Amino acid sequence: ARIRDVQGDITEFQGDAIVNAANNYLKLGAGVAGAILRKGGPSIQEECDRIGKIRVGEAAVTGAGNLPVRYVIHAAVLGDEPASLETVRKATKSALEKAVELGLKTVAFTALGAWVGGLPAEAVFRVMFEEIKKAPDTLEVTGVHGTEKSAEAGRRATLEHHHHH
């Protein structure tokens, strides 16, 4: 899948859907998740409540409320079970296969940030990077970064992979 990295506010992303690292109970908590809930409305949480629990490693899709996208794909990394590298690799794949099922073309992840949580960020990058690279080219994947500095490092890491020098 085509990949781009930018600093930004993922509640402003203007595409098909966004991915939200979550717990398997689909309870939207602190931070970015909090932002998605405020800017979208409680309909996102209601839809989440409707689906109820899922299995750590999987992903559930709901509407996006007033967010300028169509779907929020929710990627259960922790909760029931602890968040491990495989937890994240599986959750990322899931969320992607979800975009595929739905015929999407543009879908943004909030990059690193709350995918890492006490794991090595270098490592989480890899797993998400490989997973994203396996996705079809019909899909173009944006990683919204909180700080520009982290956006740039995502870019070189991408660029340093295309070669390695």
Full 3-state SS string of the chain: CEEEEEECCCCCCCCCEEEEEEECCCCCCCCHHHHHHHHHCHHHHHHHHHHCCCCECEEEEEECCCCCCCEEEEEEEECCCCCCHHHHHHHHHHHHHHHHHCCCCEEEEECCCCCCCCCCHHHHHHHHHHHHHHCCCCCEEEEEECCHHHHHHHHHHHHHHHCCC
**Declared resolution, Å:** 2.9
Q: How many C-beta atoms lie closer than 10 Å to residue 93's C-beta?
A: 21
Q: How many C-beta atoms lie closer than 10 Å to residue 150's C-beta?
A: 17
Instruction: Assess contact for 112 and 146: CB atoms under 8 A.
Output: no
User: What technique determined this structure?
Assistant: X-ray
d(CA 148, CA 70): 26
User: Within 13 Å and on the Cβ side, how many CA atoms surround 118?
Assistant: 5
Cα four-point dihedral sign 35, 36, 37, 39:
positive
CATH of domain 1-165: 3.40.220.10
For the chain, the domains span 1-165
Amino acid at 17: A
Instruction: Assess contact for 10 and 108: CB atoms under 8 A.
Output: yes
Cα four-point dihedral sign 53, 26, 90, 3:
positive
Instruction: Assess contact for 111 and 143: CB atoms under 8 A.
Output: yes
Q: How many C-beta atoms lie closer than 10 Å to residue 141's C-beta?
A: 23
